[PDB]
Amino acid sequence: TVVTTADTSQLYALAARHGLKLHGPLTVNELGLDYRIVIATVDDGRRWVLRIPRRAEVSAKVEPEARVLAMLKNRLPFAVPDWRVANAELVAYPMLEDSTAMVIQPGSSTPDWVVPQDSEVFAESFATALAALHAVPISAAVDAGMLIRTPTQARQKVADDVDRVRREFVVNDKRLHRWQRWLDDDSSWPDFSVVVHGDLYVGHVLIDNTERVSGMIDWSEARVDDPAIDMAAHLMVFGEEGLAKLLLTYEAAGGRVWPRLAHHIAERLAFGAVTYALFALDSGNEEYLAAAKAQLAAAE
Ligand SMILES: CC[C@H]1OC(=O)[C@H](C)[C@@H](O[C@H]2C[C@@](C)(OC)[C@@H](O)[C@H](C)O2)[C@H](C)[C@@H](O[C@@H]2O[C@H](C)C[C@H](N(C)C)[C@H]2O)[C@](C)(O)C[C@@H](C)C(=O)[C@H](C)[C@@H](O)[C@]1(C)O
Ligand SMILES: Nc1nc2c(ncn2[C@@H]2O[C@H](CO)[C@@H](O)[C@H]2O)c(=O)[nH]1
Numbered sequence: 001t002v003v004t005t006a007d008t009s010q011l012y013a014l015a016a017r018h019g020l021k022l023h024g025p026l027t028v029n030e031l032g033l034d035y036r037i038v039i040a041t042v043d044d045g046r047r048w049v050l051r052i053p054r055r056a057e058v059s060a061k062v063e064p065e066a067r068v069l070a071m072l073k074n075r076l077p078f079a080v081p082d083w084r085v086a087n088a089e090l091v092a093y094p095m096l097e098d099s100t101a102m103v104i105q106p107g108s109s110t111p112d113w114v115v116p117q118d119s120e121v122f123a124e125s126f127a128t129a130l131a132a133l134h135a136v137p138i139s140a141a142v143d144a145g146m147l148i149r150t151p152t153q154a155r156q157k158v159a160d161d162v163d164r165v166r167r168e169f170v171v172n173d174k175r176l177h178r179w180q181r182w183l184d185d186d187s188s189w190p191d192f193s194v195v196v197h198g199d200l201y202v203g204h205v206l207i208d209n210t211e212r213v214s215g216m217i218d219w220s221e222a223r224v225d226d227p228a229i230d231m232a233a234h235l236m237v238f239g240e241e242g243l244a245k246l247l248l249t250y251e252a253a254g255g256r257v258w259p260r261l262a263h264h265i266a267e268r269l270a271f272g273a274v275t276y277a278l279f280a281l282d283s284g285n286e287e288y289l290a291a292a293k294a295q296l297a298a299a300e
Contacts, residue, residue, distance in 0.1 A: 005030070011038060011050070018085045020048065020092055029106050033283050034058045039095060049081070051091035059088035061220065064145060066091075068222050071144035075136050078129055079206065079215035098214045101126075101202040114202055115211055117238055125213040126205065126234070127249035133216075134194040134227055134255055141195050147223035149193055154226045159183055161274050168281055171296045175273065178300065182267040188260050194227045201233030228261065232269040270300065 006028045015022045024041030035058065038050040053059040066086040073080060085092035101122065102114040115122045142148060149157060162179045165171060182188060197204070198221025206215035235243045243262060251257045258264075273295050280288035 006038065011040065014052070014090055015040070015042075015050065015092070018087065018090050018092065020085065031106055033285065047095040047097070049093050049095050051093075053088065053091070056088075062086055062088060062091055065220055065222075067144045068146055068219060071140055071146075072136065072219070072222075075140060076129075076216075077132050078213055080219065081217055096206055096215045096217065098206040098208050100217075101205040101207045101211075101213075104203070114237065115207060117242065119211045122207060122211040122213065123238070123242065123245050124249055125211075127246050127255075128253045129205075129213040129216070130200075130230060130246075131250050131253035131255035133197060133230070136195040138193075138195070138224060141224045146195070147225075149223065149225045151189065151191055151193055151226075154193055155183065155189055157225075158271065158274075161271075161278060165274050165277050165296065169277060169293060169296050172299050175270075175296065175300055178267075178270060179274070182271075188264045188267060190226055190228070190258055190261075190264070192256065193224045194256070196221075196223060196225050196227060196229045198222050198225070198229060200230040202237055226264075226268070227256070228265045228268045231265045232272060235265050235269050 006026055008022075008026070011026070012022045021043040022040050023043045026038055026040035029037040032054075034054055036050075036052040036054065038052065040048055040050055042048050053062060063086070066083050069080055069083055073082070079096050079098075081093040081096065083091055083093050102111045104111040138148070162176075162183070166176065197216060197219060199218055200216070204216055204218045205213055206217065208214045231243070231246065234246055238246075240262075243265060247257060247262060273292075276288075277292040277296055280292035283289075
């Protein structure tokens with residue numbers, strides 16, 4: 001006998017309760033704070049992703065996300081997870097076998113690989129894919145019960161997040177002033193909202209062998225909100241040059257822009273410190289909290 005991390009008997013029983021018969025290789029990621037993620041082979045010869053909520057508060061999020069994905073399926077020219085099982089104890093979908101646009105070993109802080117800066121096919125297809133997502137009608141989001149933020153509500157959410165961090169943490173004065181100046185800078189903020197992915201970066205984008213965007217995964221943060229939310233990570237990973245190329249093609253593909261969009265994206269990226277700190281706080285994880293506190297106290 002050999003000790004293995006996966007509990008095959010419990011996983012089999014769980015899947016079988018939802019009409020899936022596990023048979024063959026599987027792999028387990030337990031590093032998620034909210035879900036256990038298993039990639040398992042099923043008797044259809046196919047690999048499936050089992051997204052297993054850990055606790056009642058996580059399970060509560062399954063039904064609304066399922067409605068989002070069901071709405072998005074026909075309205076995007078790329079693949080999203082097809083949640084053929086979606087309930088409080090299990091989400092399961094056939095694996096989208098195309099690679100993520102970055103590869104990282106679980107637990108590692110350094111990727112093995114990220115789609116290259118000079119991949120024009122990736123850059124271009126990510127820009128058009130993003131324009132397509134942001135073109136999903138608001139009416140479809142409303143009909144699917146999505147979280148909707150008007151421009152005023154979008155700005156209020158950012159203000160609320162900043163204020164929550166200010167209450168719970170001690171923040172570098174210049175950082176605080178940056179965020180406040182941003183919140184007060186009317187010209188930075190868009191006069192419309194769009195359907196956003198909400199957690200979009202190379203690790204949640206799938207690409208085919210040619211590096212063309214073919215899918216997006218991990219839609220739990222999707223909502224109607226500020227478009228720049230989905231562009232901050234592109235600026236981090238690909239720099240100002242990558243951002244410039246993105247904005248030209250996004251606009252050419254029909255994406256709605258505004259004159260200070262590039263500036264706003266950079267402020268959104270800086271606001272990632274707030275997002276991280278609140279994630280750390282809500283996680284209860286002391287290592288994440290240690291990192292957040294150190295970042296917040298530090299000068300940018
Ligand atoms: C390049 C490759 C690296 O990716 C990033 O830099 C991108 C660009 C971050 O997004 C950036 C940009 C942005 C906008 O998110 C896309 C911003 O919100 C976050 C804070 O930082 C990611 C993804 C962050 O995750 C996000 O952290 C959120 C607190 C919660 C969110 N999710 C579970 C809800 C989650 O995905 C976060 C913190 O870096 C993940 C930890 C694990 C890492 O340190 C890992 C190792 C990363 O360094 C990375 C994978 O190697
Ligand atoms: N290539 C691929 N990776 C996935 C899929 N679903 C989940 N993942 C991986 O598992 C993580 C948690 O959902 C993701 O961030 C990816 O690394 C999928 O359908 N295709």
